[PDB]
Amino acid sequence: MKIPEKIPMKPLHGPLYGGYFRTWHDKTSDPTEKDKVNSMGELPKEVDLAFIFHDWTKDYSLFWKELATKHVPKLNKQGTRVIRTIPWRFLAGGDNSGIAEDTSKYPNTPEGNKALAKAIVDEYVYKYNLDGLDVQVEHDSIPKVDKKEDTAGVERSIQVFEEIGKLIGPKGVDKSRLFIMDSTYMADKNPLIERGAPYINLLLVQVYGSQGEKGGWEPVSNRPEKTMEERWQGYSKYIRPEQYMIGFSFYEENAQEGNLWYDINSRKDEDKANGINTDITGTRAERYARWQPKTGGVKGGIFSYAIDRDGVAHQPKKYAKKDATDNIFHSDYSVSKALKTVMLKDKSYDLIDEKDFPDKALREAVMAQVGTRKGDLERFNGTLRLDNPAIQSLEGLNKFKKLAQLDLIGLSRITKLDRSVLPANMKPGKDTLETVLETYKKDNKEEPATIPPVSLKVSGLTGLKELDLSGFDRETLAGLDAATLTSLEKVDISGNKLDLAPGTENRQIFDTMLSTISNHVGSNEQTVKFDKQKPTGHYPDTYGKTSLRLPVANEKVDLQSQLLFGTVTNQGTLINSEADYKAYQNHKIAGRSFVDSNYHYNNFKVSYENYTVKVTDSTLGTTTDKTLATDKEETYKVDFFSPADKTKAVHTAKVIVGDEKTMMVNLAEGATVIGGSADPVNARKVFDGQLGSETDNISLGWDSKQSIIFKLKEDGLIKHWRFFNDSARNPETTNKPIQEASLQIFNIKDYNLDNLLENPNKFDDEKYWITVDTYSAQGERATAFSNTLNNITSKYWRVVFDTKGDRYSSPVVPELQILGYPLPNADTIMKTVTTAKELSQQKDKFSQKMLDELKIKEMALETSLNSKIFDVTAINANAGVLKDCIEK
Ligand SMILES: [Ca+2]
């Protein structure tokens, strides 16, 4: 085989069209077949990139000869590059890797990977003098070991990809050979793109079918996902828009169910004898030819899979479950030529020239930093840094529609900056580009995206005489290095959204410009304009009122109006009230207000209307009413929540109505279950400090009545209890409510605790317990019950929950709370109260004076034990005084 000398070709210049020609459809591939009438050499000049798509199980030696000696020179002569496509798995060792199976020649070392890269280009590029290499990064081609996807192989393939890139592609020794990646992944899922992208000329992404085009519908957000724009946005982090190409597929003969894309037109149902349709009209392919990113810039182009089937009509969708469309036809590549013709009609590709930017230094910066196409000006949303002091005119900058950041640095020749020489997105606005794709909504009309206004940095413009930023609704002056604008004689920043209050960053920038103008030409209403501001109101980051004290009275207070208020500017000025906003309007600059006279407190302030609250009382009962009635003496914790997160409080405050009461803790959280006729694993979830999910089974057991025997973790003085019905967890629960309940404490004065602990089931009867409260349901919907309890002291408890229902009406209780204050030795303390009471009865043994004295000490202890503010210290003190008086 004499390999002919490479015919030189011009540099790649978009928009480009590529196509994947299947080797088993070249007529030279397998002489023994009759149906094979196509030839890769016949691809027309409209094809920029002809990819060889081969079946690795096949030899086709005669095709390789025809390809190397005939197709490549013919195709190169007309401008078409021929690219060899290989799978991901060739770039590491493992199953079916081919060259890398030789582990002695190509070990997984730096020398070995380098050797492997060379072997790969030697074989797939230079052997037939081809124009490039295309690696398929698709999960079907991933490295495997013993049919298992292999992490070591994936990591290896990245290093090998880099080594191939040192040989070919834009960073390689031989830049005349292209290095291409084609991928089915979204960028954030593609393991090779981060380290691989600097080495490739182009990235091809397959987007066949309606789902490639529109994305998929996601029902629980009611929104498309993986849309064409989203796939591009992910890749935009790694490659330039001109390197991006999107692909559709032709109809493959005999295609199966998961390979039916309908990207080109179908055979007419009744046109049974027609296998052909070369019409581009209304095809996904023709929409792809015209599609452009809404941001970044205009695309590299499009490609097709199975170009050997160009013009073959798609099999009708009806028969997707013997068609003319399944025959083999000789293509003339009419569809490909028509799609290239559509792209060449796209004026987005006209070159940026001296009519866009007449200043050659500015024009050169744009071309270097932005791109070379007029369509890029409409889309580019990154940074343009203009720090070449040669720049003498900024004419043209208004052609930027979406630029994110503009730096004007040291441009000492520039004498004026205003609307006419600044980006079109100095002011707010929405996307005006229109989609050419189908969408899931009405008439393919999507919600225009907001364009963020450009951020502007200006420093060292020492020749600048006029700065007019008027009427742009600018949010800040941040970026204006005022101390360096030493020539300024006129400034207008009126009609923006600037907070210019004394002390702010904006005011400091302004005052600096003001001194400069004042010293040059004088500050007056002509040379200095700054009013009609409408500064944006934001939510403060934190809130300062963390306590509210209210008398007991017949009133209702709005917690939000009392606790959660305030609007702040982006400059940090806080306006808590109408009064503050009046004082803000009071601010004068050279005698006049800077705030717009039509911008009142109501247009400025943020709204707290959809904020929510959780109000928790001293006994841990909860409501969500924004309004609190003050007729009851009670102490509360109040949490406020943004609509954006009903789980993270943005502010918390304590509200005290009447005299402060200590918040109780739930003394039964973490309680230990030791008995009761009822599932111990579920029983414990009544103590787990959460309602639970309705995914979790929290049923106590089978029959309708269930006990739980338990021990508190800590010694406490118990003053309340609460249990929840299942409706507290799910309001729609089919679980009946507790009709009957009993809370009981163990009778350690008639029975031995050691007996309870040794056989808890023996003790699972009322006779051995003392009932301290009983609930019987009134009838109406109640998500919970709570009741006071009188200074109960007990380590061991029993609870009985009964739904009173029939079979399958299991008591379901999200949580059981036993509330109090912790109090170590509480039994001992209450035992002394009990002894003092006993003594006070022995009216023959003790005189009235002894008893009166003992009474005073008993009262002092009782007073402290029930004090609103609970104090273990004072309780302990009074308890020792009473114990002493007990002797005797
Ligand atoms: Ca629970």
PDB file of C-alpha atoms in Angstrom, residues 379-473:
ATOM      1  CA  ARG A 379     -24.447  36.229  23.536  1.00  0.00           C
ATOM      2  CA  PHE A 380     -21.120  36.665  25.284  1.00  0.00           C
ATOM      3  CA  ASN A 381     -21.579  36.737  29.048  1.00  0.00           C
ATOM      4  CA  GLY A 382     -18.078  36.709  30.500  1.00  0.00           C
ATOM      5  CA  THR A 383     -15.496  39.423  31.088  1.00  0.00           C
ATOM      6  CA  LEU A 384     -13.984  41.937  28.653  1.00  0.00           C
ATOM      7  CA  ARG A 385     -10.838  43.520  30.130  1.00  0.00           C
ATOM      8  CA  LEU A 386      -9.781  46.712  28.334  1.00  0.00           C
ATOM      9  CA  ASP A 387      -6.387  47.590  29.752  1.00  0.00           C
ATOM     10  CA  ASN A 388      -4.532  48.523  26.578  1.00  0.00           C
ATOM     11  CA  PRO A 389      -3.911  52.283  27.008  1.00  0.00           C
ATOM     12  CA  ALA A 390      -3.591  52.618  23.191  1.00  0.00           C
ATOM     13  CA  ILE A 391      -7.400  52.304  22.973  1.00  0.00           C
ATOM     14  CA  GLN A 392      -8.681  55.691  21.697  1.00  0.00           C
ATOM     15  CA  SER A 393     -12.389  55.036  21.099  1.00  0.00           C
ATOM     16  CA  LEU A 394     -14.914  52.745  22.779  1.00  0.00           C
ATOM     17  CA  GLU A 395     -17.330  52.982  19.854  1.00  0.00           C
ATOM     18  CA  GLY A 396     -18.866  49.529  19.475  1.00  0.00           C
ATOM     19  CA  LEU A 397     -19.236  48.545  23.103  1.00  0.00           C
ATOM     20  CA  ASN A 398     -23.005  49.077  22.801  1.00  0.00           C
ATOM     21  CA  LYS A 399     -23.072  45.964  20.605  1.00  0.00           C
ATOM     22  CA  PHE A 400     -22.508  43.773  23.693  1.00  0.00           C
ATOM     23  CA  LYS A 401     -25.912  42.571  24.848  1.00  0.00           C
ATOM     24  CA  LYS A 402     -25.099  40.206  27.799  1.00  0.00           C
ATOM     25  CA  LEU A 403     -21.568  41.008  28.869  1.00  0.00           C
ATOM     26  CA  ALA A 404     -21.132  40.228  32.649  1.00  0.00           C
ATOM     27  CA  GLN A 405     -18.064  42.272  33.499  1.00  0.00           C
ATOM     28  CA  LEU A 406     -16.363  45.220  31.763  1.00  0.00           C
ATOM     29  CA  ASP A 407     -13.049  46.512  33.051  1.00  0.00           C
ATOM     30  CA  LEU A 408     -11.825  49.901  31.784  1.00  0.00           C
ATOM     31  CA  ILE A 409      -8.330  50.136  33.115  1.00  0.00           C
ATOM     32  CA  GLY A 410      -5.784  52.890  32.467  1.00  0.00           C
ATOM     33  CA  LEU A 411      -7.471  54.065  29.232  1.00  0.00           C
ATOM     34  CA  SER A 412      -6.087  57.623  29.591  1.00  0.00           C
ATOM     35  CA  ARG A 413      -7.183  58.671  26.088  1.00  0.00           C
ATOM     36  CA  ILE A 414     -10.901  58.283  26.771  1.00  0.00           C
ATOM     37  CA  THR A 415     -12.701  61.611  27.500  1.00  0.00           C
ATOM     38  CA  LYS A 416     -16.333  60.520  27.823  1.00  0.00           C
ATOM     39  CA  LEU A 417     -18.288  57.425  28.989  1.00  0.00           C
ATOM     40  CA  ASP A 418     -22.029  57.234  28.375  1.00  0.00           C
ATOM     41  CA  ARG A 419     -24.825  55.018  26.899  1.00  0.00           C
ATOM     42  CA  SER A 420     -23.449  55.299  23.384  1.00  0.00           C
ATOM     43  CA  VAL A 421     -20.133  53.657  24.267  1.00  0.00           C
ATOM     44  CA  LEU A 422     -21.216  51.168  26.942  1.00  0.00           C
ATOM     45  CA  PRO A 423     -22.881  47.734  26.700  1.00  0.00           C
ATOM     46  CA  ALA A 424     -26.598  47.539  25.919  1.00  0.00           C
ATOM     47  CA  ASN A 425     -27.086  45.704  29.249  1.00  0.00           C
ATOM     48  CA  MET A 426     -26.028  48.680  31.371  1.00  0.00           C
ATOM     49  CA  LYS A 427     -29.754  48.643  32.250  1.00  0.00           C
ATOM     50  CA  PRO A 428     -32.041  45.683  33.157  1.00  0.00           C
ATOM     51  CA  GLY A 429     -33.635  43.710  30.320  1.00  0.00           C
ATOM     52  CA  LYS A 430     -34.601  40.187  29.120  1.00  0.00           C
ATOM     53  CA  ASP A 431     -33.331  37.827  26.465  1.00  0.00           C
ATOM     54  CA  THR A 432     -34.581  38.853  23.034  1.00  0.00           C
ATOM     55  CA  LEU A 433     -33.100  35.907  21.108  1.00  0.00           C
ATOM     56  CA  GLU A 434     -35.831  33.478  20.089  1.00  0.00           C
ATOM     57  CA  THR A 435     -35.583  29.689  20.216  1.00  0.00           C
ATOM     58  CA  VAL A 436     -35.777  27.705  17.066  1.00  0.00           C
ATOM     59  CA  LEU A 437     -36.302  24.390  18.969  1.00  0.00           C
ATOM     60  CA  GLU A 438     -39.596  22.720  19.966  1.00  0.00           C
ATOM     61  CA  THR A 439     -40.493  23.017  23.615  1.00  0.00           C
ATOM     62  CA  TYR A 440     -42.984  21.415  26.034  1.00  0.00           C
ATOM     63  CA  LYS A 441     -45.013  24.626  26.450  1.00  0.00           C
ATOM     64  CA  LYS A 442     -47.384  26.501  24.127  1.00  0.00           C
ATOM     65  CA  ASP A 443     -46.244  27.284  20.555  1.00  0.00           C
ATOM     66  CA  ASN A 444     -42.602  26.755  21.646  1.00  0.00           C
ATOM     67  CA  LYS A 445     -42.537  30.165  23.450  1.00  0.00           C
ATOM     68  CA  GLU A 446     -40.315  30.044  26.534  1.00  0.00           C
ATOM     69  CA  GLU A 447     -39.965  32.520  29.427  1.00  0.00           C
ATOM     70  CA  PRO A 448     -37.289  35.048  28.367  1.00  0.00           C
ATOM     71  CA  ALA A 449     -34.320  34.838  30.773  1.00  0.00           C
ATOM     72  CA  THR A 450     -33.243  37.873  32.744  1.00  0.00           C
ATOM     73  CA  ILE A 451     -29.982  39.386  31.483  1.00  0.00           C
ATOM     74  CA  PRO A 452     -27.965  40.512  34.479  1.00  0.00           C
ATOM     75  CA  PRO A 453     -26.742  44.085  33.910  1.00  0.00           C
ATOM     76  CA  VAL A 454     -23.049  44.381  33.203  1.00  0.00           C
ATOM     77  CA  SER A 455     -20.795  45.022  36.188  1.00  0.00           C
ATOM     78  CA  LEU A 456     -18.483  47.992  35.472  1.00  0.00           C
ATOM     79  CA  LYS A 457     -14.979  48.582  36.754  1.00  0.00           C
ATOM     80  CA  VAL A 458     -13.314  51.903  35.822  1.00  0.00           C
ATOM     81  CA  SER A 459      -9.831  52.814  37.078  1.00  0.00           C
ATOM     82  CA  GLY A 460      -7.035  55.057  35.800  1.00  0.00           C
ATOM     83  CA  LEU A 461      -9.188  56.855  33.209  1.00  0.00           C
ATOM     84  CA  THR A 462      -7.283  60.083  33.967  1.00  0.00           C
ATOM     85  CA  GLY A 463      -8.459  61.835  30.791  1.00  0.00           C
ATOM     86  CA  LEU A 464     -12.160  61.287  31.464  1.00  0.00           C
ATOM     87  CA  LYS A 465     -14.127  64.573  31.530  1.00  0.00           C
ATOM     88  CA  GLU A 466     -17.710  63.331  31.482  1.00  0.00           C
ATOM     89  CA  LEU A 467     -19.331  60.268  33.082  1.00  0.00           C
ATOM     90  CA  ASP A 468     -23.046  59.813  32.340  1.00  0.00           C
ATOM     91  CA  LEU A 469     -24.521  56.687  33.933  1.00  0.00           C
ATOM     92  CA  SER A 470     -28.013  58.220  34.111  1.00  0.00           C
ATOM     93  CA  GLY A 471     -31.289  56.341  33.898  1.00  0.00           C
ATOM     94  CA  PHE A 472     -29.788  52.842  33.917  1.00  0.00           C
ATOM     95  CA  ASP A 473     -31.259  51.611  37.283  1.00  0.00           C
TER      96      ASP A 473
END
